[PDB]
Structures are given as C-alpha cells and as structure tokens.
Amino acid sequence: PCSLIPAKEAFEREKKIYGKAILSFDGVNGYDVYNCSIPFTYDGKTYIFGRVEKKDEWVHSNSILFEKVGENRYRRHPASITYNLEDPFVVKIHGEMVFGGTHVTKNGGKVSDYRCEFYHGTPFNLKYFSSGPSKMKDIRLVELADGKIGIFTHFRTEGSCLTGFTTIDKVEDLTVEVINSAKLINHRPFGDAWGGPSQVYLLSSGLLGCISHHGYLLDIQLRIYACTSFVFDPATYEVYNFKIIGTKGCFPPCEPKLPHLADCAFVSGIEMRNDGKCNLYSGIGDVAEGYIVIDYPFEGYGKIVSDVAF
Amino acid sequence: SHMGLLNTKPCSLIPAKEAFEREKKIYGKAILSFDGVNGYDVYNCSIPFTYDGKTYIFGRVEKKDEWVHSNSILFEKVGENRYRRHPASITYNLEDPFVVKIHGEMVFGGTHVTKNGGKVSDYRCEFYHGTPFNLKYFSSGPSKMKDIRLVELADGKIGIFTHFLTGFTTIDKVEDLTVEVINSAKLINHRPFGDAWGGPSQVYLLSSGLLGCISHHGYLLDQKDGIQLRIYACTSFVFDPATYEVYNFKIIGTKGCFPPCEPKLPHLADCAFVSGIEMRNDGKCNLYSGIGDVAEGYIVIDYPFEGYGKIVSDVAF
Ligand code: NA
Ligand code: NA
C-alpha cells in the first residue's frame, strides 16, 4: 500500500487553507487553461504561461503567455509567440528566463515520443537551445547559491520512477548526456509515489525547496495526483520534510477533463505573500488553474531567495 | 570537367540554369513587406491562401543575425505586397512552412528542429490539419527528412512526395500519414534531375489527372578566387502517379530574377527557395520564393505546366 496514502488522508483531514480561487483566462476562444508556470514579473507587469487545450481534445495543447489584467484575471498577450508545448515552466538563471515545456511527437495521430524543450532569453524574446532525452518529462532547473545550475531529472522509461540531480556551469551546457548521467537522489522519502518537482527554489540556507507533483494508485484503483514539497541538500543528495501541501479537493470545485482525473492536481509552484503565507498555484482536473493560501512549506529550512522578477 | 580542378564533377543542372538566365521570360517582380514581427526577416513562405474573405500567408520568421531561431507565423494581407502578423493565430516552432488542401481542410507542415546544448541534433517535418486558425498536430515524418509534400489526387486518395532521391506513395486519409508509409515510398524517375539535390515545394492537381510539381533544385558552385555558393533555383516538373514518370523538368526562377537583396550570408547570393505559384487572371502565374534566406518575393512567369492541363486544386479555404 502506498506510503503517501496515510500522509494524504491525514492532510485531507487536518490542512490549514486560508483562501482559494480559480483563475480566469481571456483571449483563447474559451479553451481550457491549466498546468501553468508560476506567475512572474517583467517590465512592471505580471505574466503567466498557460497550457491551452480544448476541453474535448486530448494531446492538442499549446503554451501561451498571459498578462494579468485584473484580480485573478489573465489575457493572452498578443505580442508573444506561442510554443507547441504542454506543461510550461519558468525559472531565472544568471539574470535571464529559462522557459521549458513538453514537445509531443505523433505518428499518424498516436503519441510516439515526447521530450522537454528549453528556451532562454527575456520573456518576449525566448530562444530555443536544447531538448532533454526521449520520454523524460520532469526536468527542472535552479541557480544554486554558488552560481552553478542545478538540474532535477526523472528516470521513468524502464518501469521505475527515480529522481536524479546534476549541475552545469552555463545553461547552454544542458545536454542529453549531462541529464542521462545525473546521480540518483535519496528517493526513499517519496516511498512508491511517482512524480517530481514543478518549481525549485534556492533557500537562504543554500538548500533547495522543491514544489512537486506526486501520484499514486489507491485501492480496482484510484489515480491520486497531489501537490507535495520536499527540501533537497545538493551537498549530500539527501531529501527532507517530504509532505502533501494540497489536493484537488482544496481548490474550488471544477469538473475534471474525464472522471478518472477527479483527484488530479498538477502543481505550478508557490508565490510568497506579505503575510508570510504563500499562494500555491496548481493545474486542477486537467481543466483549470487555481491557487490555495497555505503556510510556507519550507519553514525551518530558510526563506526563498530565488526570484522570477525579470 | 568544364571547371577543371575547381570541381571535377560539376552539377548536371548548371547548363539548364545558365540557359534559363539567358532565355527567361519575366513579366514583373516584387518583394513582399511584413509588419508585426519587430523588423525580423520573413522568408521561405507558404503560398498565399484565402480564408473567410481574406488572403493569408505563413512566413518563416528569424532575426537577420540569428541562425536556427525560426518560428512560423500567419500573416494577413494588408495591401498590395504587404502582410501583417495576424494576432489571433498561434505560432509554430518550425522552419519553412507549407500548406495544401486535403479532403476539404488545410494540411500545414514545417520543419521542427531539435538541439543538444545549442547544436542541431535532429529535425523532422511536423504536420497539422484543420481550418487555418484551428490547426491540430497529428504526425511527424522520419528523422532528417525535410521535403515531404502532400496533394489530393484525381481519385480522392492522398499523394505523398518523400526525399531520401524522390519517392511517391498514397494513403486514404490524412491520419494514416506515418513514418512507416513515408519510408516505404517507391522511388520516382530521377533521370531528369541528374545529380542536382532538392524536391517538390508545392504540388497541384491538373485537369489531365497529372500532378504539377513546383520544386527546388540546387548544387554547390565553387568559385575561382571566390567563395562556394549554395545554389537553389525554382524548378517545375509534371508527374504521372500511375507510372512514376517525370515530364517537362525545367528551371522557372532564380534569385537574380527577383528584386535585389543582400543574402543572410554570402554563400546564399544565388539561393531562391521556392514557395509556389498562384494563377493570374491574364493566364500567367506569380511565382513566390524565399530569396537569400532574408526575404520573400514573386516574379511573373508563363504557366509552367502549359500543355499538361489547368490547375484544378485550390487553396480557397
Ligand atoms: Na493513424
Ligand atoms: Na553547449
């Protein structure tokens, strides 16, 4: 029985949620928008990347830049190009944006391959520079306290579900060879959950705070995808403080894309508030993006010192 | 060889290209203007097409001083030879966009490039279908195969041109376009093309049931006390899908026919990468081409399939 199951059942019973909202998106012909990047700032405005897909289409996503135009309200920014990608994500590395998402290959309508594509530059001038290995979805970058680039990898091509970590010096050093050879982290804390980070934060302690998506099957089975967090030490490859920090049921209700996704959240990341709490953004049901207001999940391991102020 | 040690095996196509430069009949020319892409170069366009009362074209968009940083963008016609990015359309992370009509809808394609640490590692054609503002991704061709082009045949089947040597095969519906179908295509009659490299860019159904192909063919031209040119000329041929026979292979355009423009790099000073033809009311055609990997123009030429039937395919969506 999954080790995550007690932690989830417990969390569902004793969470502290201080607020919640579903986001509104304009300028995409009423398409669903989900599995967003975290919000980021550029030249005095707030932006977010969204995965854009018709509610009744599967594997027909594009990643679109949205400008915040009001309280929980976003509109497609027409100046930006779009990206033929699923599950867009951003991070700041060496003073610039690194943007990625999943590029899907089909063979006569059937998915045959997929891999992460990485862009860098400024938010309206992103340049494609590298792809990750075939069938690896869950790659995330962060700038380490000493200026190196940390890379989380997910090995799931062989029936297994293991997380790796490696470093490079400059973002154009990101290769399939570096990714495939990443040293395995201590995954024992995750138990038989599968997933990995959505957003990685540099903490004042020099540890990495990871806001992660983990899935498991609950006994016929149920698919559960939960918002999780853990703290990682790049010096030892140790994992600390693994926990559930949100579930789909914490967000306002919305009908999932199909009933098998009724307990599916795909986390985006956290944004610190003035009050010391944070907004936890998540994709929900593969149909929507929302946030819940939660306690800071890395309390005791340091404050976030990475930023997405471009 | 006529080039002595400069090239021991000059391309078979050189005399045809030189003869065209002496004997061509060009009735007009223009460079297209593009708005809405921050002054980026726009080149290697689709043919123009119509939709919902307006004229459109797909452009390959790239900064003049950047290599392998293209996107394909839908442009709406503003005025004579003037286009602007249509803000409602999504963009495609592709080079060398192309369109055709199949079974009443658009099939759009382009080249998706894969990199490894900044270096090109792979590329393949990606295919979309639907209406022009509602295109859905459905298939990729094989690794490193650039020149795949579709056409609806007289009998309602879908014709597929491949590049290994040019191949041709058929399928019943666009969803059956697979790597396995493309790789198993039979070779067409290559004898007319000699040792020129290239293949079709735009394929048209003719009233005779034959296919009119607007193509790109080229070769390397080594120069005495000069640099090597990558020559690309606009060519055409007529193809019989019943016999795989090729007729009327010829040169129909060269970069020198279009208004002047400084190429992206000096090796592209004689590079025209054809887009396709559009019939005029006067029975001539506009031949659209990318030029120098920096611009898009057209020249006014005689109908290149004259004698083999009228175009009966369309791009009126
Ligand atoms: Na199929
Ligand atoms: Na590199």
UniProtKB/TrEMBL annotation, chain A:
It holds the Pfam family DUF1861. SUPFAM superfamilies: Arabinanase/levansucrase/invertase (SSF75005). It comes from the Eukaryota. InterPro entries: Glyco_hydro_beta-prop_sf, MPT-1-like_LmxM. This is Uncharacterized protein. It comes from Leishmania mexicana (strain MHOM/GT/2001/U1103). The lineage of its organism: Eukaryota, Discoba, Euglenozoa, Kinetoplastea, Metakinetoplastina.
